[PDB]
Every structure is written in C-alpha cells, then in structure tokens.
C-alpha cells in the first residue's frame, strides 16, 4: 500500500563519475528505507538501512540521504564493480514494497 517511485530506470556514466538515484514514498516512512545492489544473476545485497546507515564492509563511496518521503542514493565515484541494479525498499509497513530499480552501467 505504500508506493515507491524510483528514478531513473537506467543510466550510463563513466568510471569516476557521480551517480544520483532517488526514491519518493507515497507517505512518510519514518526513515525506514533500505538500498540494495543486485548484480546480474544474484540476490539483492543490503548496502544501507535506516535510509542513511551503511552496513559493514560497504565502500564509503556509497551513501544515502533523505527524510520523510524523498530519499536519494549517491555513488560518489563509479567503479566497474558497481554495475548492477539498485533498488530502494521501505520496511515501515507490510507489505514491504520496492521501487522499480535503477540499472547502472559504465559507458565506454
């Protein structure tokens, strides 16, 4: 019932470039937003929870800001091993819903 709108659907940048992705929730989700990275053929991995808190082992080039309804995810410097599909998910209320995902690629 909480709808997540994520943007863009895909983007191609260069290694080193900054990447910004956003999620807007149809309602105040009190910081309960999580960002995952899903590489090809693998399950999603948790990078950030509570909207801004990185998980252990996660590079610092990854970060997440936002509050209430608008949330953003930044990759300060794109690395080739960052190619994947990123998704936001609110866990404020069931059913936990995902944004449509943003596929990120390295232009060449």
Dist CA 51 CA 3 (whole Å): 16
CB atoms within 10 A of CB 40: 8
DSSP state of 96: P
| Tokens found for residue 51 | 């909207």
Instruction: Give the method of determination.
Output: X-ray
In degrees and rounded to multiples of 5, residue 23 shows phi and psi of: -135, 135
| Tokens found for residue 2 | 């909480």
CA 7 to chain centre: 10
Dist CA 82 CA 59 (whole Å): 10
Helix locations, the chain, DSSP H: none
> Which of 76, 84, 69, 85 is CA-nearest to residue 33?
69
Fold classification of 1-108 is Immunoglobulin-like (2.60.40)
Domain extents in the chain: 1-108
DSSP state of 31: T
* Resolution to 1 decimal place, in Å: 1.8
């Amino acid at each position: 019932d909480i709808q997540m709108t994520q943007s863009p659907s895909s983007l191609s940048a260069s290694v080193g470039d900054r990447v910004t992705i956003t999620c807007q929730a149809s309602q105040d989700i009190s910081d309960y937003l999580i960002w995952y990275q899903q590489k090809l053929g693998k399950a999603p991995n948790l990078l950030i929870y509570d909207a801004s808190t990185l998980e252990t082992g996660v590079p610092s080039r990854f970060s997440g800001s936002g509050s209430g309804t608008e949330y953003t995810f930044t990759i300060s410097s794109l690395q080739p091993e960052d190619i994947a599909t990123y998704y936001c998910q609110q866990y404020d209320d069931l059913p936990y819903t995902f944004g449509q995902g943003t596929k990120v690629e390295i232009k060449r």
